[PDB]
Amino acid sequence: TKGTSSFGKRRNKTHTLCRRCGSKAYHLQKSTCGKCGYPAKRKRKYNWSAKAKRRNTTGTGRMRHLKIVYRRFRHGFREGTTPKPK
Amino acid sequence: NKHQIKQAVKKLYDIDVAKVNTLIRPDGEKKAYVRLAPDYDALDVANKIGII
Amino acid sequence: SSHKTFRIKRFLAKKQKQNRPIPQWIWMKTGNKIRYNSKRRHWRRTKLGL
Amino acid sequence: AKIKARDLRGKKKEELLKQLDDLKVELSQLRVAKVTGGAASKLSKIRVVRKSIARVLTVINQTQKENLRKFYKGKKYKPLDLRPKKTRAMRRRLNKHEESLKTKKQQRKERLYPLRKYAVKA
RNA sequence: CGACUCUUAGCGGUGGAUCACUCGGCUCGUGCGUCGAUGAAGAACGCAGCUAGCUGCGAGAAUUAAUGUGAAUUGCAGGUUGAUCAUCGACACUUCGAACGCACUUGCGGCCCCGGGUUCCUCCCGGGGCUACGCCUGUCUGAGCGUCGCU
RNA sequence: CCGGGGGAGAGGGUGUAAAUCUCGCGCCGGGCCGUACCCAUAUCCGCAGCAGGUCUCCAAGGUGAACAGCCUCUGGCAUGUU
RNA sequence: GUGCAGAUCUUGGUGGUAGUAGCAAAUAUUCAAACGAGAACUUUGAAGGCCGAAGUGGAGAAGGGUUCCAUGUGAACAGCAGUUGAACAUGGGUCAGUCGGUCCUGAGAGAUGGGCGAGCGCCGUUCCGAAGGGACGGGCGAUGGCCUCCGUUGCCCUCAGC
RNA sequence: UCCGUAGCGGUCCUGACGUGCGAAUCGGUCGUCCGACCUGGGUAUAGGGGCGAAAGACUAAUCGAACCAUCUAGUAGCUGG
RNA sequence: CUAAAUACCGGCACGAGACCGAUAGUCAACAAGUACCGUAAGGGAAAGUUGAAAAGAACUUUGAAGAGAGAGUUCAAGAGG
RNA sequence: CGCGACCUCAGAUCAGACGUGGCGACCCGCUGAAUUUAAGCAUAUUAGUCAGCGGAGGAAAAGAAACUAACCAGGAUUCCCUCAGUAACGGCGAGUGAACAGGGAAGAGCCCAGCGCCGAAUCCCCGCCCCGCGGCGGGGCGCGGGAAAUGUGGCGUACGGAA
Ligand SMILES: [Mg+2]
Ligand SMILES: [Mg+2]
Ligand SMILES: [Mg+2]
Ligand SMILES: [Mg+2]
Ligand SMILES: [Mg+2]
Ligand SMILES: [Mg+2]
Ligand SMILES: [Mg+2]
Ligand SMILES: [Mg+2]
Ligand SMILES: [Mg+2]
Ligand SMILES: [Mg+2]
Ligand SMILES: [Mg+2]
Ligand SMILES: [Mg+2]
Ligand SMILES: [Mg+2]
Ligand SMILES: [Mg+2]
Ligand SMILES: [Mg+2]
Ligand SMILES: [Mg+2]
Ligand SMILES: [Mg+2]
Ligand SMILES: [Mg+2]
Ligand SMILES: [Mg+2]
Ligand SMILES: [Mg+2]
Ligand SMILES: [Mg+2]
Ligand SMILES: [Mg+2]
Ligand SMILES: [Mg+2]
Ligand SMILES: [Mg+2]
Ligand SMILES: [Mg+2]
Ligand SMILES: [Mg+2]
Ligand SMILES: [Mg+2]
Ligand SMILES: [Mg+2]
Ligand SMILES: [Mg+2]
Ligand SMILES: [Mg+2]
Ligand SMILES: [Mg+2]
Ligand SMILES: [Mg+2]
Ligand SMILES: [Mg+2]
Ligand SMILES: [Mg+2]
Ligand SMILES: [Mg+2]
Ligand SMILES: [Mg+2]
Ligand SMILES: [Mg+2]
Ligand SMILES: [Mg+2]
Ligand SMILES: [Mg+2]
Ligand SMILES: [Mg+2]
Ligand SMILES: [Mg+2]
Ligand SMILES: [Mg+2]
Ligand SMILES: [Mg+2]
Ligand SMILES: [Mg+2]
Ligand SMILES: [Mg+2]
Ligand SMILES: [Mg+2]
Ligand SMILES: [Mg+2]
Ligand SMILES: [Mg+2]
Ligand SMILES: [Mg+2]
Ligand SMILES: [Mg+2]
Ligand SMILES: [Mg+2]
Ligand SMILES: [Mg+2]
Ligand SMILES: [Mg+2]
Numbered sequence A: 001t002k003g004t005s006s007f008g009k010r011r012n013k014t015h016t017l018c019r020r021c022g023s024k025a026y027h028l029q030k031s032t033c034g035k036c037g038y039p040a041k042r043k044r045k046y047n048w049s050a051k052a053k054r055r056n057t058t059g060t061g062r063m064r065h066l067k068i069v070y071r072r073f074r075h076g077f078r079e080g081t082t083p084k085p086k
Numbered sequence B: 001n002k003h004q005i006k007q008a009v010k011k012l013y014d015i016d017v018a019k020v021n022t023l024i025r026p027d028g029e030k031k032a033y034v035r036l037a038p039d040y041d042a043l044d045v046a047n048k049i050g051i052i
Numbered sequence C: 001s002s003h004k005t006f007r008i009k010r011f012l013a014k015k016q017k018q019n020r021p022i023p024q025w026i027w028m029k030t031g032n033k034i035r036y037n038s039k040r041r042h043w044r045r046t047k048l049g050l
Numbered sequence D: 001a002k003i004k005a006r007d008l009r010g011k012k013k014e015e016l017l018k019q020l021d022d023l024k025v026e027l028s029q030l031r032v033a034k035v036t037g038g039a040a041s042k043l044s045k046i047r048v049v050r051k052s053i054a055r056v057l058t059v060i061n062q063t064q065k066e067n068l069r070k071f072y073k074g075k076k077y078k079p080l081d082l083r084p085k086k087t088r089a090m091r092r093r094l095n096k097h098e099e100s101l102k103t104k105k106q107q108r109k110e111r112l113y114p115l116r117k118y119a120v121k122a
Numbered sequence E: 001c002g003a004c005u006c007u008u009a010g011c012g013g014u015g016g017a018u019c020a021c022u023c024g025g026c027u028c029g030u031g032c033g034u035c036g037a038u039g040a041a042g043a044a045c046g047c048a049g050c051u052a053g054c055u056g057c058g059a060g061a062a063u064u065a066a067u068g069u070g071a072a073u074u075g076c077a078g079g080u081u082g083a084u085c086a087u088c089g090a091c092a093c094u095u096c097g098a099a100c101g102c103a104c105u106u107g108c109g110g111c112c113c114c115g116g117g118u119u120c121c122u123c124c125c126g127g128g129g130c131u132a133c134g135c136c137u138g139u140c141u142g143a144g145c146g147u148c149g150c151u
Numbered sequence F: 001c002c003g004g005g006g007g008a009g010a011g012g013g014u015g016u017a018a019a020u021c022u023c024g025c026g027c028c029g030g031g032c033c034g035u036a037c038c039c040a041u042a043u044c045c046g047c048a049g050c051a052g053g054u055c056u057c058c059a060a061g062g063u064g065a066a067c068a069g070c071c072u073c074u075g076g077c078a079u080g081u082u
Numbered sequence G: 001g002u003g004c005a006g007a008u009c010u011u012g013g014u015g016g017u018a019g020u021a022g023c024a025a026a027u028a029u030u031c032a033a034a035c036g037a038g039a040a041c042u043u044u045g046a047a048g049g050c051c052g053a054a055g056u057g058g059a060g061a062a063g064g065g066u067u068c069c070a071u072g073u074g075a076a077c078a079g080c081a082g083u084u085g086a087a088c089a090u091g092g093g094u095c096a097g098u099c100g101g102u103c104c105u106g107a108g109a110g111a112u113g114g115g116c117g118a119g120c121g122c123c124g125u126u127c128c129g130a131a132g133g134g135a136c137g138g139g140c141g142a143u144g145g146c147c148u149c150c151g152u153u154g155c156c157c158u159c160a161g162c
Numbered sequence H: 001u002c003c004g005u006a007g008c009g010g011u012c013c014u015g016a017c018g019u020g021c022g023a024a025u026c027g028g029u030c031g032u033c034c035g036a037c038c039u040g041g042g043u044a045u046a047g048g049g050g051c052g053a054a055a056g057a058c059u060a061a062u063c064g065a066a067c068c069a070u071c072u073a074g075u076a077g078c079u080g081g
Numbered sequence I: 001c002u003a004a005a006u007a008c009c010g011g012c013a014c015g016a017g018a019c020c021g022a023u024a025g026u027c028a029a030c031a032a033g034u035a036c037c038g039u040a041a042g043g044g045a046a047a048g049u050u051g052a053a054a055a056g057a058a059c060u061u062u063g064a065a066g067a068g069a070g071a072g073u074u075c076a077a078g079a080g081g
Numbered sequence J: 001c002g003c004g005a006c007c008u009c010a011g012a013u014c015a016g017a018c019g020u021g022g023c024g025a026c027c028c029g030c031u032g033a034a035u036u037u038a039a040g041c042a043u044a045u046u047a048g049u050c051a052g053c054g055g056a057g058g059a060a061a062a063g064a065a066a067c068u069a070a071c072c073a074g075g076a077u078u079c080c081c082u083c084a085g086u087a088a089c090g091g092c093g094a095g096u097g098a099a100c101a102g103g104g105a106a107g108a109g110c111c112c113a114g115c116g117c118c119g120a121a122u123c124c125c126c127g128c129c130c131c132g133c134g135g136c137g138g139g140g141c142g143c144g145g146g147a148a149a150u151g152u153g154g155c156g157u158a159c160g161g162a163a
């Protein structure tokens, strides 16, 4: 009874897609995320899982501002000047 | 919105609209059925825009 | 279900669009290794999470 | 014709918007041809018209931004996009002026006891 | 003689060992040592003539401008006053996210200014700018059978 | 959402009457999201087209106490991985 | 990081068993024709049957996410086969003021004030709170139009429970 | 309250099956079927904790202390190489 | 209040090696934190090599086709995606 | 009753600023075990270590003696060698365990409050004029506004200082 017969009643879901981390760990009934902890301002991370930290680090995603910061660093963050025209 | 679709057809194709009915496809795109006025003819509008 | 929400339907729309085979002309390219689409999904086999 | 960015800069904003609204009519006419099924010459012109629209809008936005920074050139308070965007910590530093103050005590100390240039015989 | 079985060799299959390669790792050392409310990290969704993934990019969407370079890109088509690459200092940068009008259904607003509507008469529609918390200095409006002074 | 009790008030000086109307018509508008199909001895969960599990609506004729069992009509199916 | 036969060693590959166990729950199929290279299994007609209104019928909720529909294919899958399929490949398909969501509160969840806490934070939901940004009538002020008469916002008097 | 259907449950055959339809099913036979009844959805209680008409039962096929990661390559006078 | 000498398995850019050579070396030489699994926290692979150059086998013939037989390319198909 | 100060406390989509979150190898402040060893085990050991929390920088922290010493004395901090597996702690069992002196790398010193003297001699903000203007500054005006006597600035700080 506790196995195959009991697996047929799984029809309503506990977790949904989180709006901050994108993972399906937003507990609908506790209103919190088990992956990032969305209503908390700080994201949840721990030193007892080094493998979970390297799945979400600054090198994981697009870096759509930091990679321009790294390029702009080499010229002293020059701004408001143009190269000399032809 | 349906209002924006209505006033967008009225400017690009210079035809007034009876009503607009929208749906969202499983493709993800929004399809709009735009009914013209009874005095404008939809296929003679379609000819000048290209679809035939 | 038929009582979808907008974000779920949009996610299903993207996962519908990624489920097409590769175009025929990509493996005539010079630096090509792809034989087929290995990220394919069938509705009966893989249940997409959710 | 090839729409260049060098000869759009001397034009006025209204005759630039006229070209922009003409090229958008060109995109709509080309996208109708794409869905009806058209020539490859019509299909390959979509990338040409899109980058021309990007060029015209880039010229319009650059001209507007240059006039905004000409208007706010001598003003104490300017909009944050026209303010210099360095890094956040570098924008929260002290000025040249602020790092170049020293007190009246250190001013008279530097005056009274300057660092002398000297040498010692071997 | 024949079938079946055993051994060895030739050839052929099954299998991918060995060897030779290596735009990858590991380790050591050097220089620099730079994120974010001017909206970070992360995520979501889109963008190619034919495009699923990876990569790149953001409705200007496998990129715009400028500079250097100098005749290509290419799987197939199409079209030197500068094609393509590289640099990148100008411009731009959808949605969620510290995430900021209230909530997170993608829902309900409020104030002000514009354009249709109207002809300031409120409706209606579209667009733009504001509307989070804490805290510093100053301003304005206040409270007190707090301490007083004077009519 | 409505009815009542109260009566602060408003309206006109005998009329091209006024304030007012929950009466009959007339004018304009209603934005955003979901909507296909399966819903079960094959579209869900049990590693699967798994004799298991999974919430409901409709409910003909005869026999019969009967939504029992058996036969039949509308509808459905091909004997349940040969 | 130097020699393997073993560690119910690790990973990968292959045998005997073995063309064996098996393809046996829910009564049942038969004849003719068509398409085709090919038919026990596809389609059509004629039978004989079953589910027998608490159905093997007709519609929904949850869940699934294109499985729905049309055409083509028979490489792989559908434990025989297939001319067939929920398989593959091309194309299509979900239209609302009235049907639901959206609004309300339920059990309950959860900020601020406050309290606690080394700290992320936690407790607590009216409890140690100056918690109302509103309205009618009047006075004052300005605006815009038949500046007639309403409307607009600025200040004050007045009133207000939750 | 009794017989008894749907529903809920699971006595016996210690039947079938037992590299099964199935990591607990099937057949006949059975208990109950107006009330301490059955059931969907929402919500509350979380691990030395919950919850228990009490079997150390249940707490995602895991229960006399669930599951995941880390301390951790824990130690072994013992077994095998 | 205060530089220097001191620390640096993260980041950017580099150089080197008595290191490893696709069951090794990072989990990852490849569309790798990807496919896939679990409600979740998390777990987590496998997978390099035609040739110098696609010159990647035109055409004939059997078969419905997969498949063959000739012919042809190449130094070599005893290198046939 | 009213008016005007000051104090204390509110409300603003008031004018101008700042903080939040990320990464976290190295650094700072807390909190903090049990495996293990003691051939058992409880003090100890593991270990102020793993885990947990907060906060930064290109380094951080520390730092110019309420010091070391007992000498014919040295003289901020940080790091290396040595002191030293030493003094010492420890069911004095298992085990743990520095500092001074000495040799080097580097070397840099300083400022307030108080006590006093100077007419608050000091500081911030808004308006205008010209310049700089892409790290918002300079002088000139304003019978402009505030902060500050419940104390700003100059001299001056233990090496003495002031007149
Ligand atoms: Mg629940
Ligand atoms: Mg944190
Ligand atoms: Mg399934
Ligand atoms: Mg001084
Ligand atoms: Mg042989
Ligand atoms: Mg795309
Ligand atoms: Mg260019
Ligand atoms: Mg150029
Ligand atoms: Mg809701
Ligand atoms: Mg009355
Ligand atoms: Mg329907
Ligand atoms: Mg079946
Ligand atoms: Mg049968
Ligand atoms: Mg049959
Ligand atoms: Mg070696
Ligand atoms: Mg061996
Ligand atoms: Mg047999
Ligand atoms: Mg039906
Ligand atoms: Mg049915
Ligand atoms: Mg078969
Ligand atoms: Mg079908
Ligand atoms: Mg209608
Ligand atoms: Mg709470
Ligand atoms: Mg009874
Ligand atoms: Mg009874
Ligand atoms: Mg038995
Ligand atoms: Mg048996
Ligand atoms: Mg069976
Ligand atoms: Mg408790
Ligand atoms: Mg009970
Ligand atoms: Mg017992
Ligand atoms: Mg022993
Ligand atoms: Mg200090
Ligand atoms: Mg060297
Ligand atoms: Mg490997
Ligand atoms: Mg090899
Ligand atoms: Mg090989
Ligand atoms: Mg050879
Ligand atoms: Mg060869
Ligand atoms: Mg303000
Ligand atoms: Mg402590
Ligand atoms: Mg012991
Ligand atoms: Mg022992
Ligand atoms: Mg022990
Ligand atoms: Mg730690
Ligand atoms: Mg921080
Ligand atoms: Mg930094
Ligand atoms: Mg420091
Ligand atoms: Mg010392
Ligand atoms: Mg010694
Ligand atoms: Mg002893
Ligand atoms: Mg110790
Ligand atoms: Mg010393």
Ligand SMILES: [Mg+2]
Residues within 6 Å of the ligand: none
């Ligand atoms: Mg020296």
Ligand SMILES: [Mg+2]
Residues within 6 Å of the ligand: none
């Ligand atoms: Mg003083």
Ligand SMILES: [Mg+2]
Residues within 6 Å of the ligand: none
């Ligand atoms: Mg001193």
Ligand SMILES: [Zn+2]
Residues within 6 Å of the ligand: A018, A019, A020, A021, A022, A023, A025, A026, A033, A034, A035, A036, A037, A038
């Ligand atoms: Zn999350």
